[PDB]
């Protein structure tokens, strides 16, 4: 389950930024799709040890 919600929020984040780029920075669809591929290729595909740690520490300490 930690990993499931981690990727849900990835989509939230991506959606927010890419949409802001379209809405507030005048960005065209081609470049928006470039940054989508850039973002996936560089942020995804590892094992997310740094990210997953934050969630873990938080889950542990809410007790």
């Amino acid at each position: 389950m930690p990993m499931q919600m981690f990727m849900q929020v990835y989509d939230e984040i991506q959606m927010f930024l890419l949409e802001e780029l379209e809405l507030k920075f005048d960005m065209d669809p081609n470049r928006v799709r470039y940054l989508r591929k850039m973002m996936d290729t560089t942020c995804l595909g590892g094992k997310y040890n740094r990210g997953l740690t934050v969630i873990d520490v938080a889950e542990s300490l809410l007790s």
């Binding site: 290729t41 934050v54 938080a58």
Partner: protein
Amino acid sequence: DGARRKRVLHDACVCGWMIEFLQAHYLVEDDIMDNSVTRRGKPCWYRHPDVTVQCAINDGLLLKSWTHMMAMHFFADRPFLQDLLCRFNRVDYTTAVGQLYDVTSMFDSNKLDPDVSQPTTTDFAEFTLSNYKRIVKYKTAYYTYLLPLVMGLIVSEALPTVDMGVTEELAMLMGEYFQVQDDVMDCFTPPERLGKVGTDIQDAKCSWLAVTFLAKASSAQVAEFKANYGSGDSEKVATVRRLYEEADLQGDYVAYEAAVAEQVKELIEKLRLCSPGFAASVETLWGKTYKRQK
């Protein structure tokens, strides 16, 4: 009121991506700086057929900016937002210093002057464990181990509850070890398990292998290393590999690991004492480090 749990958890994932986006930025740019081929199974961003070098530099920069944009959007109304961003930027700054240490480790620092040209060191007097530890502490430990732990503490509003002095010792130790592990794989783990091709030898880097070889090796071994290190040539590179095997670095590795493993174990117990929930998460984190194959 599982609302707190939802809010804390969600804040946690956002912070997790702040760090992954940070990492991502560092890898785009490390890859150009290190002249690397492959990363995570695919070409390095700057080596993508339709990605120009100039644009990959910039894209790395957008990645960094997105850590700030996401934080500011999700944490807009959040008491800890300024505490969070201060710490985050310090770490980020600390990491960039660490990279200066790394990238300049091949030049005699006494002749390090912008105005005047200079080749890679021929004596390697700077390839010391002391200097190695400085490189690695700054370029890897803070962002990789201290920063995730700290962020979880901040969104849980639990930062004052733990012994930071110990936490920091642990982060430094685990971070060192993580990088020692990274340096070994670079040279000995096959590229298809690793997802990347090692460039440490070619780039003449101050890796743990380099400094550990040099401190124990003979005059003769060292002269041969000096004649084959920092070169793309594949025979020269294969020699260096042979010299590391021959010098039994794998012996020293096993010994370092164990010293690391028990000193880590001691500090987690010092921490389990006033802070059992956090120590448990530090033990999982250690768990994903100790004898990783990646």
